[PDB]
Amino acid sequence: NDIHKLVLAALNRFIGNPGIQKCGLKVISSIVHFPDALGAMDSVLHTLQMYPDDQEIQCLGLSLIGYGHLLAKILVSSLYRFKDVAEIQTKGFQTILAILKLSASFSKLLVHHSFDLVIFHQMSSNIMEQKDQQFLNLCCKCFAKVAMDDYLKNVMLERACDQNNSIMVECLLLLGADANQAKEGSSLICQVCEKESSPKLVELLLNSGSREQDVRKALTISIGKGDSQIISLLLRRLALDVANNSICLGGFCIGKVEPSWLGPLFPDKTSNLRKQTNIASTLARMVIRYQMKSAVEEREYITSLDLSANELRDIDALSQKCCISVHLEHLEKLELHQNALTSFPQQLCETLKSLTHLDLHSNKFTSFPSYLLKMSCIANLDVSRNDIGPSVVLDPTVKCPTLKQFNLSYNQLSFVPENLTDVVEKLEQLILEGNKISGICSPLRLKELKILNLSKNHISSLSENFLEACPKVESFSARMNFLAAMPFLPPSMTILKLSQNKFSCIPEAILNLPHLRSLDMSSNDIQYLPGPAHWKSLNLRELLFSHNQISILDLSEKAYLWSRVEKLHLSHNKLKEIPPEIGCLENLTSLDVSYNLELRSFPNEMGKLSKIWDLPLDELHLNFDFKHIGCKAKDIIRFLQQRLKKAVPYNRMKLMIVGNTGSGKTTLLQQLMKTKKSDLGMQSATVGIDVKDWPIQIRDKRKRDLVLNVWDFAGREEFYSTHPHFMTQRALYLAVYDLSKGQAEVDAMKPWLFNIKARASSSPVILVGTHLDVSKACMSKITKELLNKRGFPAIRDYHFVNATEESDALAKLRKTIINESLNFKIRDQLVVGQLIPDCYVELEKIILSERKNVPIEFPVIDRKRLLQLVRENQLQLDENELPHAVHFLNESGVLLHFQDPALQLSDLYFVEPKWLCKIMAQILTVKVEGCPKHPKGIISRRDPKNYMTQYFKLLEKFQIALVPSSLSDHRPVIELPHCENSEIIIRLYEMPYFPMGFWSRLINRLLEISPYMLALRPNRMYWRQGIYLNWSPEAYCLVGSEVLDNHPESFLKITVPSCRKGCILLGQVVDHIDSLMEEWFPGLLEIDICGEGETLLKKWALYSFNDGEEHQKILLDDLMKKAEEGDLLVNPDQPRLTIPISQIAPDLILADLPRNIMLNNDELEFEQAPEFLLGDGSFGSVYRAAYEGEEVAVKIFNKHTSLRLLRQELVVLCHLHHPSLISLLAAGIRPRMLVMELASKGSLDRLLQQDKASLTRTLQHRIALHVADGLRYLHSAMIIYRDLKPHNVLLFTLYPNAAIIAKIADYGIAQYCCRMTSEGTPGFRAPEVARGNVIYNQQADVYSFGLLLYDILTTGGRIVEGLKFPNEFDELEIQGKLPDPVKEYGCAPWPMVEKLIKQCLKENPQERPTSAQVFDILNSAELVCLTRRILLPKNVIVECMVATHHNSRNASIWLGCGHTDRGQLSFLDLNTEGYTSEEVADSRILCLALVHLPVEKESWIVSGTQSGTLLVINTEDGKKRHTLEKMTDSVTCLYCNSFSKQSKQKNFLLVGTADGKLAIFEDKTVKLKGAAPLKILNIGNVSTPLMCLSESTNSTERNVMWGGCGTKIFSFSNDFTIQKLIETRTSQLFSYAAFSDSNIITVVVDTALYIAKQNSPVVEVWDKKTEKLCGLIDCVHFLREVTVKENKESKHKMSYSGRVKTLCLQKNTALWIGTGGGHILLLDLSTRRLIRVIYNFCNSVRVMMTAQLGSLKNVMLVLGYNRKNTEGTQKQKEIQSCLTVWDINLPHEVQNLEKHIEVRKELAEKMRRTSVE
Ligand SMILES: Nc1ncnc2c1ncn2[C@@H]1O[C@H](COP(=O)(O)OP(=O)(O)OP(=O)(O)O)[C@@H](O)[C@H]1O
Ligand SMILES: Nc1nc2c(ncn2[C@@H]2O[C@H](COP(=O)(O)OP(=O)(O)O)[C@@H](O)[C@H]2O)c(=O)[nH]1
C-alpha cells in the first residue's frame, strides 16, 4: 500500500499533457484516499486550463479540487462553461462548500471573480418544479456560507440588479441587503430604471428600504424615458395616501401628466394577484435555516388629486376618454395651482361631475373660460393669479348656483364681473383684490354675499346702491383704494376694514351700523374721531386708527358704551394726552399710543385695565424711566395702579462729585454739608466712592426737604476701572480744579468731563474752583475758551470757592446747586419732584431704618429677609412689585441690587452701598512687595468666614478677574507673522479720549470668548491696552492702543489677517467692541445734529491700492463706505484699479459668516414690488420667489433691523441645520434681505382652521413628531424657543409617509436673543410665562408643545372659540383647566396622547417631561394605532365578546360575564360608551355569536353557556328570547359561517360544546323554539372537549371549515363530514410534551395552520396537505430577548407566566399573538418573525377579534385584563377589563414609522456635516 507511485504518477500526468489525463486523474482520485498522501494541487489545477472543455475530466477535476486565488477563477469559469450540462454542478458546489468551511475569507474571493453569474442562474434555472431537492439543498448550503459577510450581500445585490433577476433580488432582500447604499446619488433605483428593468424588479426595490430622495431622482430618470409600468409604481410610493384617498403630486417637476401613468393609482376592484414569488420566500427560509445552523452549534374612489408644482404646460392629456376618464367623475378636489397652464380643456370640465374645490392659480390664463361653471356641483372656484383679460363678463347661459367662493385675486381686471347676479346666486366670498378695477361698480344685486373684498383696486367711490341689495355682507374690506365715503352699508356688517384710503372724517354711514364689531381705518388722513356717543353699536371690539392725524381721543362723553373694546391702535398721531376716562374700558387688551412724540404722560386711571398684555412705548417720553429689565407693558399697569393708590412727590437726587487725584472734593464736601466736626484733623486720600447723604430742608416757601446723596468719587487714577458703574443718567455732577495748577490742571481735567458726556449725555455739570488762598485766576478764559461747548457736556455754571471755610462764594455755590437740582428737567420732566406711589417711599423708609440694623461684617440682606420685612410692615407690595421697586430704589442710591442673571448673586441686596463701594476698591490698592513671581497683574487666590468666596464671586462677575488695572501699562514688543500691507485688515476707532472703564471692560469681553473659529484656545500676551491673541500665523488679532504723531486723540488699532478665518475674527471682535459702546456709553455714539455729526467715534477703515509697500494707508470713514453699498468694490478718482470691499471690511458685507450663505444676487429671480408674490403672510414681509431654479421665500426686512443686529441673528441662525428646522439658504444686501426654504402648504393654523379634512390622525402624528424633534434639537443646543403656536409650524406636504413634513420657524429665537413677544402669545403661553414672576425654562416650551398638541387634536377648535372670547381664551387655560378634548370637541379619542397632554399640562415646571422624553414617547408606534380604551365598570369579569358589522353605521360590541357564576349578557355601545347589565341565563355564559338574517331585517344574537342552555335573543327586543334545544355539556364555541351551497344566499350556525357534538343549524331556523339540528355530528369524546373553530382564508375552496377538537384538529365542508384527523401530540420534535399534549385552544386557517394549546408558550405550524409541523415558533423566544435589561426581577421568574391565550390573524400581512401575560406579539408571517412586542398596556390578553365600525372598517378589539392587588393580602385582586380597540393597520406603521425615523436620523447627520464644512 506504500510505493513511490504518487510522485511518478503526478509528474507523468503533468508531462503527459495532450491526452493522457483521462486515466491519470482517475489514478490520482483512487490514490488520494489510501495512504492519506500529502505538491499535486498546482498541477491538477494547471491541467484544467491546459485542456478544458472535456466533461469527463472536468467532473473528475472538480471532484479532486476538494483534496492563491486562481482556483476560484477556474471554478466558476468551469461551472459557467457547463451551466446546465449535467449534474456536475453537484460536484462543483460540493467543492465550494468544502473549501469555504475551512477558509472563510475565500468566499469573498469567489464573489470577487464571477460566482454570482452562476449561482443566480442555478437558483433561477427553474430548479423549483425540477425535483432536484438534494441539489438545491446543496446550492442553498453553499449560498448560506457565501452570504456570511453583509458587504458580500450588498455587492451581490448590486450585481444582481444589473442583470434583471426578480426571484433572486427578492431572495436577497429577504436576507437583509439594504437597497439604499450604492452611491446616494446614483443608488439602486436610479440605474434599475436607467437599464430598462422589469416592473417586478422596481416594485421589490421600492417596497423595501429605499430612500425617498433616490426615488424622486429615479422618477426624473423614468420621466426621461417613456415607461408606463415603472412610473405608476414610483408615484404609488411617492404620492398616495390610501388612508385619505389622495394623490399628493405637488412638489415634483413632472414635465407633463399622462393618464397612462395615473391609471393604476386610482383604486381598482379587479386587482387580485396570485402567489408565485413564494419561491423566493422558500429559498430565503432555506438560507436562513442553513445560516442559523452554521451559527448555533458552531369603492372608495380617491378624491384629492394634487398637481400643484408640476410645470404642466398643458393638461389636455386627461381630457380624453382614456383609461381614467371614469375614475375622474368623483374627484371632489383638484389642484392645478402654480403650473403654467392655459385654457382648461372644455371636455374635462364636464367629464368630472363631482368636483368642488377646483383651484388653479398662478397659471398663465388670459380668459376666464366661463365654461368652467357648467360643472354639476362646484364650489370654491379659485383662479387668483392669472392674467385674466380686462373684462371677465360671465356668459348668461350658465345658471350655476352652487358656487360659493369665487376668487379672482390679482388679475388684470378692469371691472367687477358683469353677470354675477344672473349666474352665481348663492355666491358668498366674492374676492376681487389686487385687480385694476377703476370705474364705479355695479349695483351688485347679490343676495348672499357674505365676505366681499376690493383691496388694492383703483376705486373712485362706491355707487349709493352698491350695497343696497346685499343684506348679508359681513366683511367688506376695500384697502389701499382711493375712497372717500361709504354708500349706506347694510345693517348686517360685522367686520369692516378700510385702511390706506383718502378720508377726512369717518363717514356717518359707518357710525351707525347696528352690529359692527371691528373697524380698521389705518393710514387714513382723518381729523376727528367721534366720541363713543356716536357709534350706535354695543359690540365694538377693535378700533384700529393708526397713522392718522388725530388731535383728541374723546372719551369724556360716555366711556362705558365702549366697555368691550379690545384693540385700540392710535400710533403715529398728533395726540396730546390720554383722557382719564380711558380707565373705564376694562376689556381693553392691546392699547397703542406709540410714536406720538407729544403724549408725555400716562393718567393714573389706566391702572384699572388689568387685561392689557402689550403696550408699545416706542418713541415717546414719560415721567419715569421704563424698560429696565422689566416693564413688560404689564408691570406698567401695576405701577399706574399703585400710583393711583397714593401718589407722593419724591424728593431724592444724585450729586456725583468728581475730581482728579487731589482737589477740593472732601474738604469741599465737608464744607457744603456744613459739617462742623471733621474730627480727623487730616483726612487722607479717598478710597472707593464714599457715599454720604445729607438732607436739605430749604428754609424757604418751598418746604420740599430734598435729600441728594453725594458720592465723592475717587481722585487717584488707581480706582478708575469701576466708576462707570456709579454714573447713572439722573444726576448733577460737580467737578473741581485745585486751581494751584491753574491753566495746566484744567487741561488734565478734560478726560473726566468727557466721561460725563459718555455716560449721561443729558446730565448737568458744575465746575467749582477750589483755591483762592493758594494764590492765575484767568482760568475762566480757558474754560470759556477751550472746555465749554466742544464735545463736552452741558456745562451750566462755574464757581471759585475757597472750600476750606464758609464763604459768601460757598453760599452762592449752595444756591446754585439747589437751583440747578430743582430745575433738572430731562425730556422736560422735572426729575426732582416726580410722582411715585407712596409704597416706594414706605419701602425706602423701612430700608433706611434697617441700615442701622445690619451686620457690619456683611451688610447684605437676603431676599428672604426682605420678604420678611415687607410682612413685618403693612406694605402694599406683592412679588410683582419688588422687581420694579428695588430697581427704582437702586436708581435713587438707596441699595444696589443686580438683576443680571449671569451675576448669580441677585438673591443678595446691598443695603448700605457705602460699604460695597469701599470693599470693591480694597483689592485695587493692596500691593505685593514680596517676589514678583508672576508678570505684573496676574494673580491667583491669595487673601473672612465664607466672605472670601462671595468677594470674588462678585469681583470676577465684576470682571476684575488677573487685575486688568495696574497691569503693565507699557506694551510688550509684538511682531505679526505677516506685515506686507495686503494680507491684513485694519480698522480705527479715533475718539477724543478713552472713556474711564473702557479697556478694563474691553479686554475682558474679548478675553473669555475662547471658542473662536468654531475649542482651541489661543496664546495671548495682554498688557493694559492690548490683547494679541493668536492661534497660528493663519489666525491672530491685535486690539492695540497707539497714538500717532501729531494726533492728540487716541486710536484703537485692530489688525487681523485677511484670510478667511480672519474675517470671522474681525466680525466677532467688532461686534463685541460696538455692542459695548452702545450698552454703556450712549453719549459717544450719539450723533449730535447740534453743530455737526461728529459722533466722537470716527471708526475709520484703512485700505491701500498699491498691494504691499503702499507707503501710506488710505483712510475711509466707515459710514461713507457703508453708503458705498450699491456696489461691492471701492475705487478712487482714478478708476482703472479697484479694491474689493469684501477684503477691507468683511463685516459690513455678510462675509464673516460661513461662506455658503452668501447672497449670490445674480441667481435670485425675485420681484419685491408685486403683492401677489407676497402670498406668504397676509400683508406681511415674507415673499415668494425663485433662486437656484427652486422656489424659496425671501424675507424683506424693514428699516428696524440695524445691520449689526442682522449679523447678530445670522450668526446664531447659521449653525442649527436640522431636518425639522427652517434653514437659511442665503442672505445679503441690496436690499437687506434673507432667503429661506418655501413651506409650500403654509402655516399650520390655516390648515387646521379651514382645511380640517386633511388632518387624518396620522399626519396629526407626523406633525407632532417633527415639532417634538425640533424642540429636542433646540433644547439640546441649549436655547428655548419660547413661543410656539400653530402660526409657527410650517408644513411642507400633506402626504403622510414623507420625510420632511413639519418645520418650526426658528427666526423667532434669533429676533428674541438679539434684541432683549418674549412673554409669548396669550393663548399659547405656559403658566409660569403669563404670571412672569419666575425666570423661564424649557418647561415652558414643553407646555407650549402641550397646547400645540391640544390644538392639533381638536383641529383648531380652541383657537376659533378663543378668537371670539380671548380674555377667557387665556385665563381659562392659564390654570391647567382647559376642557376635555372629547366632550367639548368632536375628535377621535386617541387616548394614548391624552395622557401625553395631561403630562405636558402639569403646572409644576420640573414635573413636566423633558423634550427628549416627549419626543421619545411619540416615537412609539402604538400611540398612532391605539384608538380608544374603555375601562369597564369596577370588578366586572368578562371573557367573551362579539361585534356587529351588519349595521356598520354605529356598532355595539356585545360582551358576556364571568363575575357571576350565573349567566348575564353585557351590552356595550361605543359612541356612547354606556355599559348595561341584564341577567339572562341561570349558568355563566361562555361565548356568543351573531346570526343576522337578510330577511325581516334583524340580527338574532345567540349565546352558548356552560349549562348547555343555548339562548337566542333578538337585536332590538331583549324580550323575544327563546333558548333552543338544551345541550348536554358546556358550550364552548359558537360560530357563524358562509355556506351558500343552495344556489342562493345561505348561512348556518355551529355550537361547539365541551364534547365535540356539532349541533349545526340554519340561518333562518333560529326563531322557532327548540331549533332542529340538521346534522348532529358528535366528533369528540367526554374527555376530548371541542374548544375552538375557524373559517377558510379564501372562498375558492368553497369555505372549507376547520375546527379543533380535543387535541386533534379536523375539518369539513358542505358534506359536513370530517375530512382530516390530524394529530398533534404525536410530534417528533419534543422539547416538551404538554405544550402539544393538552387540549387545543385556537385554530386559524391560512396557507398553513397556526395552533396553540392551554398554557402553551409555543405555537405549532402545520401544513394542510403534508400535515407536518413545518414550524415551531416559541413566545418566550421573543419575550425573553426584550425582557433582559428592563426586567431584572424576571431572573426570578424562570417558571414564566406567558403563553398564547388567543390567536387573531390579519388577512395576509401579519399575525397577532395575544399572550396570557401582559404582552402582545406581531408576526410577519412571510419573512421575519418578530416585528414588535407591545406590552405594559394590560396584564392578561383574554380575547382578541377583528371587526368593522362606522366606515372605520377593520379594527381589532383586544379585551385584556388589568388586575389591581389593592387588597392582594386578602387573596383578592381588583379586576378591570380594559377593552381596547387597535387599528388593524398597526403591523405596517410599526415597520413604516421605524423606517421614517431612520431616514431623518441620517438627515440629522448629513445636515450637520454642512456645519462642519
Ligand atoms: N418660509 C416660509 N414659507 C412659507 N410661508 C412662510 C415662510 N416664512 C413665513 N411664512 C409665513 O408668513 C407669515 C408672516 O411671517 P412673519 O415672520 O411676519 O410672521 P410673524 O412673526 O407672526 O409676524 P411679525 O414678524 O410681524 O411678528 C406667517 O404666517 C408665516 O406662516
Ligand atoms: N490749603 C488748602 N488745601 C486744600 C484746599 N482744597 C483742598 N485742599 C486739600 O485737599 C485735600 C482733600 O483731598 P481730596 O481731594 O478730597 O482727596 P481725593 O478725593 O481722594 O482726591 C485736603 O487734605 C486739603 O488739604 C484749599 O482750598 N486750601
Swiss-Prot record:
<feature type="repeat" description="WD 4">
    <location>
        <begin position="1567"/>
        <end position="1613"/>
    </location>
</feature>
<dbReference type="GO" id="GO:0042803">
    <property type="term" value="F:protein homodimerization activity"/>
</dbReference>
<keyword id="KW-0175">Coiled coil</keyword>
<keyword id="KW-1000">Mitochondrion outer membrane</keyword>
<dbReference type="GO" id="GO:0106310">
    <property type="term" value="F:protein serine kinase activity"/>
</dbReference>
<feature type="repeat" description="LRR 12">
    <location>
        <begin position="564"/>
        <end position="585"/>
    </location>
</feature>
<dbReference type="GO" id="GO:0048812">
    <property type="term" value="P:neuron projection morphogenesis"/>
</dbReference>
<keyword id="KW-0963">Cytoplasm</keyword>
<dbReference type="GO" id="GO:0099400">
    <property type="term" value="C:caveola neck"/>
</dbReference>
<dbReference type="GO" id="GO:0042391">
    <property type="term" value="P:regulation of membrane potential"/>
</dbReference>
<keyword id="KW-0342">GTP-binding</keyword>
<feature type="repeat" description="LRR 1">
    <location>
        <begin position="301"/>
        <end position="322"/>
    </location>
</feature>
<dbReference type="GO" id="GO:0097487">
    <property type="term" value="C:multivesicular body, internal vesicle"/>
</dbReference>
<dbReference type="GO" id="GO:0009267">
    <property type="term" value="P:cellular response to starvation"/>
</dbReference>
<dbReference type="GO" id="GO:2000172">
    <property type="term" value="P:regulation of branching morphogenesis of a nerve"/>
</dbReference>
<dbReference type="GO" id="GO:0070585">
    <property type="term" value="P:protein localization to mitochondrion"/>
</dbReference>
<dbReference type="GO" id="GO:0035640">
    <property type="term" value="P:exploration behavior"/>
</dbReference>
<dbReference type="GO" id="GO:0015631">
    <property type="term" value="F:tubulin binding"/>
</dbReference>
<feature type="modified residue" description="Phosphoserine; by autocatalysis">
    <location>
        <position position="610"/>
    </location>
</feature>
<dbReference type="GO" id="GO:1902823">
    <property type="term" value="P:negative regulation of late endosome to lysosome transport"/>
</dbReference>
<feature type="binding site">
    <location>
        <position position="1290"/>
    </location>
    <ligand>
        <name>ATP</name>
    </ligand>
</feature>
<dbReference type="GO" id="GO:0005615">
    <property type="term" value="C:extracellular space"/>
</dbReference>
<feature type="binding site">
    <location>
        <position position="1243"/>
    </location>
    <ligand>
        <name>ATP</name>
    </ligand>
</feature>
<feature type="repeat" description="LRR 9">
    <location>
        <begin position="492"/>
        <end position="514"/>
    </location>
</feature>
<keyword id="KW-0343">GTPase activation</keyword>
<dbReference type="GO" id="GO:0032436">
    <property type="term" value="P:positive regulation of proteasomal ubiquitin-dependent protein catabolic process"/>
</dbReference>
<dbReference type="GO" id="GO:0007528">
    <property type="term" value="P:neuromuscular junction development"/>
</dbReference>
<dbReference type="GO" id="GO:0019722">
    <property type="term" value="P:calcium-mediated signaling"/>
</dbReference>
<dbReference type="GO" id="GO:0005789">
    <property type="term" value="C:endoplasmic reticulum membrane"/>
</dbReference>
<keyword id="KW-0523">Neurodegeneration</keyword>
<dbReference type="GO" id="GO:0061001">
    <property type="term" value="P:regulation of dendritic spine morphogenesis"/>
</dbReference>
<keyword id="KW-0067">ATP-binding</keyword>
<dbReference type="GO" id="GO:0030159">
    <property type="term" value="F:signaling receptor complex adaptor activity"/>
</dbReference>
<dbReference type="GO" id="GO:0046039">
    <property type="term" value="P:GTP metabolic process"/>
</dbReference>
<dbReference type="GO" id="GO:0045335">
    <property type="term" value="C:phagocytic vesicle"/>
</dbReference>
<comment type="subunit">
    <text>Homodimer. Homotetramer; when activated by GTP-bound RAB29. Interacts with PRKN, PRDX3, and TPCN2. Interacts with VPS35. Interacts (via N-terminus) with RAB29; this interaction is direct and stimulates kinase activity. Interacts (via ROC domain) with SEC16A. Interacts with APP; interaction promotes phosphorylation of 'Thr-743' of APP. Interacts with MAPT. Interacts with RAB8A, RAB10, and RAB12. Interacts (via N-terminus) with RAB32.</text>
</comment>
<dbReference type="GO" id="GO:0006914">
    <property type="term" value="P:autophagy"/>
</dbReference>
<keyword id="KW-0832">Ubl conjugation</keyword>
<dbReference type="GO" id="GO:1902803">
    <property type="term" value="P:regulation of synaptic vesicle transport"/>
</dbReference>
<dbReference type="GO" id="GO:0006468">
    <property type="term" value="P:protein phosphorylation"/>
</dbReference>
<dbReference type="GO" id="GO:0010977">
    <property type="term" value="P:negative regulation of neuron projection development"/>
</dbReference>
<dbReference type="GO" id="GO:0008340">
    <property type="term" value="P:determination of adult lifespan"/>
</dbReference>
